[PDB]
Design a protein around this ligand. Structure first.
Ligand code: SF4
Lengths: 143, 317, 114, 505
């Protein structure tokens, strides 16, 4: 069901990050992991503008009540094989917002996450390490 | 007749190899111009295969043209390859065959707009009425230049007038001192048309900007996206081949059954040198403009220079 | 205009182009996954078919195929042309009769002289 | 083998009220058969005239001469150009009779309908077949009377008896100028025919011979879409059943209005008068008609009124070609335009019949004339919209279809003649492209709330579409073969008057 011609997406992933109520600390790290000092285009990643194209979602922020259907709505429209990488210490159970009537924490109880990266916020090398680890999982899953 | 099928298959396979490789060299040069390693050279030959890999999505409100316009686009590009000057005179070039070229170079973009607009949600409806305004606005600028040069190379004598096989007989550059000014005015209008047809630079309007970065092709998702990203690259090669055919064809004579391929390589090198200025430099050096400012520039500072060039070159013969 | 049999080669190269371009999908449907049918348009993902929190979509567009103005000195003359021609067609029977009467007189006066 | 084009429609028309006493559905299956036999007889008379000769025929004695030296009886002359009108009027008539079985069956009293629609294609053969000058008036009157009686048929609607009055009270005046011309042209010369009158017109020119031409042409220009007098068509097309407008935009405009001008200028009134005057008189109306017809064909909001104003702008091409084809006599320039204005009649009849039958199906299914409310019609009615797409691409002319080579001739003729009229033509062909592109973008959209519950028509409303599309595609593979074997020798035998009046003798 994963058939065979998908070794190539391990050499060309396209990303699209889904903000749901962050405080813009990790969104800088998504953007600054593509500038000339921490360069990432040499692997092939390419910030794309619509969820039809992409195959790695890149969810940040604690899931705020108003943005709860949107996260469940943009998960169908990405096509097949795709992974989900959760970045930060607020998809992993909130950080300081674990006790609100508005933030339903960890992102695992909404959609099936694959790789978590702790930190607040993570340095941009940790994001590269996370995407390499998830991509070698999906290379294992092919064979 | 059957010897006109072998060329149409083999030249298609050649151009489909070369065009993506030129795109890869272009992305490498643009990456090095701003302190970056950049992707490896044959990077589009992976992106093509992974776009053919995935699962195509059809929306619930979609016509029979959503699944059938990215066939007709590639079909009228492959059928256009048989009329283009690849360095040797083309295969099906008869006495007409300029208006067939202009018609089929117009018609592919209309198939693209009809394929985008034939869907549901009105991001495609706003991303299509911005397309056809720029389509109408950029094709009286090339018709005057090409009709003036095709009329003017027919005074000194040829047997297939108004045909692209007649453009290797005699060029602009031997009409005397006044033609040297029409040469640079015509270099201006042809570089402007070539930048505004493949849509990069100032004129990067209906591709990666639907109100921010949504684009026109916000909807095509699987196989269809791979076919469209192939067809636009073949059209990139075709338009620049026209530009190097009109401006300066200087090929070798070299009779034999292998002078064809030597002239083919020399034409490929001239295509590379013409893209290297326009696409790479003009993309790196200048951002977008607008749509209401991209219309009043092609009717004021490009179409005017075509009239000046055509009138001044008419006063040379 | 062009050739004598030349409009018959155009169909040949066009059909061989469609055969190659359809053969490519016939290959690429086999290798790779199938399709499915979702609907929201991937277009401002907040709402697909909802009712009201603030105002929302379903304000559909008519035929407006113009979003540009050349020298912005031609649209006024075009509208001043279409206005008079639009309200010429009144719909009264003496208009019909007077038009064919003056047409007959015009052709008669020209044919008498030369 | 050529009385049988008048015998069979009379036998179908005069025998319909005695076969409607079978009170079932025989009243249609008799009409379809009796309209089908005329197609066979039309093909055979086309083959017989293109084999050899310019055949005359005489009703009575075997010769049109008694013990005298001038014609007595009524003579028929069916030279190469009348044969195309006989061949194309017996084709769209069949395809529009077998059409309306499923359309026009919610309504009442369709026993008179089929005999009127059989009279239509009876009073339109006899204009082509004839060679007498008074017989022309009766056969122009039959067509006009039954076309008055088919427009105002649905009498209970708000404006079906509003188009009928407008067409009636002006057509019944324009069809009496012709009778005053015949009354004023009898008493001066003395004979009543079309071959021997061109002999008598040559010796003694009179002021009568020009008075009886001025209002004669001014009358026949009302049965067209000529430019000051084009208003009855614009509201006679939305107020009609769709089987009528397919046989009124394509045929009755270009039998009683173009063919008649061509015949009574090129054969009677042309050994004496300069053709160069009548050329510049016709060509002014050809240039008003383009702009007036295709300028307000882009401000519309209705669906059938769009097609009504697009079928008056295609008449300007025909008048321009037929006008340039007179100020230049036998040469190369003014010969390829008269050849370029015959081929456009048969192409325009085919594509406009195809483009009205599809609008009939759409307007029958959901019931709203407005084109702004319905959008995304191709989501739930695909085959209909594809037929519309081919029929819209064929008008402006795209080179794989047949509308290209029919219009390249008028382009190169008007460009080699004078370079102003070519610019007029290019303006007139920009505006129609704008109109059909706009109406095309209204149909590929999101499915609106008034469309979603819809289907396709049956088989007998779908079978004419297939034959028309196959005809105008395979007719487009061979454009420059059919423009040298048929329609250059057709147009060379229009100014060939000496053989006309010599084969009468
Ligand atoms: S994960 Fe931490 S650094 Fe990132 S948005 Fe949340 S609180 Fe801020």
């Amino acid at each position: 069901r994963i058939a065979q011609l998908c070794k190539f997406i391990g050499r060309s992933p396209w990303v699209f990050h889904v903000n749901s109520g962050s405080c813009n600390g990790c969104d800088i790290e998504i953007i600054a992991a593509l500038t000339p000092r921490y360069d990432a285009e040499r692997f092939g990643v390419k910030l794309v503008g619509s969820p039809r194209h992409a195959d790695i979602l890149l969810v940040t922020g604690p899931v705020t009540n108003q943005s709860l259907e949107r996260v469940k709505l943009v998960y169908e429209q990405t096509p097949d094989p795709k992974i989900v990488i959760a970045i930060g210490a607020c998809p992993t159970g909130g950080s300081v917002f674990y006790e609100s009537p508005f933030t339903n924490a960890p992102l695992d109880r909404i959609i099936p996450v694959d790789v978590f990266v702790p930190g607040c916020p993570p340095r941009p090398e940790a994001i590269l390490h996370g995407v390499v680890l998830a991509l070698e999982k999906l290379a294992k899953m092919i064979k | 007749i059957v010897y006109g099928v072998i060329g149409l298959i083999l030249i298609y396979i050649y151009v489909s190899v070369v065009s993506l490789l030129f795109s890869g060299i272009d992305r490498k040069l643009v990456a090095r111009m701003q302190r970056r390693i950049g992707p490896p050279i044959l990077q589009p030959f992976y992106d093509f295969l992974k776009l053919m890999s995935k699962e195509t999505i059809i929306p619930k409100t979609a016509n029979f043209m959503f699944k059938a316009a990215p066939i007709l686009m590639l079909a009228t590009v492959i059928a256009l390859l048989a009329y283009t000057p690849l360095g040797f005179p083309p295969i099906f070039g008869t006495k007409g065959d300029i208006i067939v070229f202009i018609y089929l170079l117009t018609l592919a973009d209309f198939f693209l707009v009809v394929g985008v607009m034939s869907s549901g949600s009105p991001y495609g409806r706003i991303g299509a009425a911005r397309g056809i305004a720029l389509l109408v606005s950029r094709e009286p600028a090339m018709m005057l230049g090409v009709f003036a040069v095709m009329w003017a190379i027919s005074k000194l004598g040829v047997e297939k007038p108004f045909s692209l096989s007649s453009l290797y007989e005699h060029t602009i550059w031997d009409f005397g001192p006044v033609a040297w000014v029409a040469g640079v005015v015509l270099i201006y209008v042809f570089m402007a048309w070539l930048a505004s047809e493949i849509e990069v630079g100032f004129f990067n309007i209906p591709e990666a900007e639907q109100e921010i970065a949504e684009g026109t092709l916000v909807e095509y998702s699987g196989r269809y996206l791979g076919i469209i990203k192939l067809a636009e690259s073949i059209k990139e090669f075709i338009a620049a081949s026209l530009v190097v055919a009109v401006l300066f064809p200087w090929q070798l004579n070299i009779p034999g059954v292998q002078g064809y391929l030597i002239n083919l390589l020399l034409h490929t090198l001239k295509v590379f040198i013409v893209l290297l200025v326009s696409k790479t430099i003009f993309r790196t050096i200048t951002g977008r403009l607008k749509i209401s400012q991209a219309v009043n520039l092609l009717w004021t500072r490009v179409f005017t220079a075509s009239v000046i060039g055509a009138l001044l070159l008419a006063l040379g013969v | 205009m062009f050739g004598y049999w030349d409009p018959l080669y155009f169909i040949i190269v066009f059909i061989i182009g469609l055969i190659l371009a359809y053969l490519l999908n016939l290959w690429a449907k086999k290798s790779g996954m199938g399709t499915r049918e979702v609907g929201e348009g991937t277009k401002i993902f907040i709402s697909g078919e909802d009712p009201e929190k603030v105002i929302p979509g379903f304000e559909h567009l008519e035929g407006y195929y113009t979003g540009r103005n050349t020298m912005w000195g031609l649209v006024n003359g075009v509208k001043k042309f279409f206005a008079t021609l639009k309200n010429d067609h009144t719909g009264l029977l003496p208009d019909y009769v007077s038009y064919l009467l003056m047409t007959t007189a015009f052709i008669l006066v020209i044919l008498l002289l030369r | 083998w050529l009385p049988f084009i008048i015998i069979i429609p009379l036998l179908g028309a005069f025998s319909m009220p005695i076969v409607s006493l079978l009170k079932g559905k025989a009243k249609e299956i008799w009409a379809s058969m009796i309209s089908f036999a005329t197609l066979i007889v039309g093909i055979q008379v086309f083959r017989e005239v293109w084999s050899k000769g310019t055949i005359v025929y005489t009703l009575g004695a075997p010769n049109p001469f008694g013990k005298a030296t001038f014609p007595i009886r009524i003579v028929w002359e069916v030279d190469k150009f009348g044969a195309l009108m006989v061949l194309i009027v017996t084709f769209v008539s069949f395809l529009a009779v077998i059409y309306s079985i499923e359309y026009m069956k919610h309504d009442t009293g369709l026993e008179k309908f089929y005999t009127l629609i059989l009279i239509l294609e009876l009073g339109m053969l006899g204009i082509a077949i004839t060679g007498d000058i008074f017989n022309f008036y009766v056969f122009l009157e039959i067509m006009s009377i039954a076309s008055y009686a088919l427009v105002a048929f649905r009498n209970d609607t708000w404006e079906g008896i509003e188009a009928g009055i407008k067409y009636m009270f002006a057509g019944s005046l324009a069809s009496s100028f012709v009778l005053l011309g015949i009354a004023l042209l009898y008493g001066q010369y003395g004979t009543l025919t079309m071959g021997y009158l061109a002999v008598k017109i040559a010796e003694n020119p009179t002021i009568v011979a020009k008075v009886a031409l001025a209002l004669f042409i001014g009358g026949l220009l009302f049965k067209s879409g000529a430019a000051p007098v084009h208003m009855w068509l614009a509201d006679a097309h939305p107020a009609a059943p769709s089987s009528i407008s397919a046989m009124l935009s394509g045929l009755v405009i270009k039998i009683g209005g173009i063919y008649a001008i061509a015949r009574i200028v090129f054969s009677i009134f042309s050994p004496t008068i300069n053709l160069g005057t009548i050329g510049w008189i016709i060509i002014i109306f050809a240039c008003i008609t383009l702009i007036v017809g295709n300028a307000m064909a882009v401000v519309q909001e209705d669906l059938k009124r769009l097609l009504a104003y697009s079928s008056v702008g295609q008449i300007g091409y025909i008048l321009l070609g037929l006008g340039i084809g007179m100020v230049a006599y036998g040469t190369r320039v003014g010969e390829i335009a008269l050849a370029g204005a015959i081929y456009h009649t048969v192409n325009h009849a085919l594509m406009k019949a195809l483009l009205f039958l599809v609008a009939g199906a759409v307007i029958h299914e959901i019931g709203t004339r407005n084109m702004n409310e319905l959008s995304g019609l191709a989501k739930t009615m695909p085959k209909t919209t594809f037929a519309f797409l081919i029929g819209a691409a064929a008008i402006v002319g795209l080179p794989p279809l047949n509308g290209f080579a029919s219009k390249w001739l008028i382009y190169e003729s008007s460009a080699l003649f004078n370079p102003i009229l070519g610019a007029i033509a290019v303006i007139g062909t920009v505006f129609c492209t704008a109109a059909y592109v706009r109406a095309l973008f209204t149909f590929f959209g999101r499915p609106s709330e008034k469309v979603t519950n819809a289907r396709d028509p049956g088989i007998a409303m779908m079978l004419p579409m297939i034959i028309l599309v196959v005809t105008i595609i395979v007719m487009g593979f061979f454009p420059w073969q059919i423009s040298d074997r048929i329609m250059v020798p057709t147009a060379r035998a229009l100014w060939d008057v000496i053989d006309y009046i010599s084969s009468l003798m």
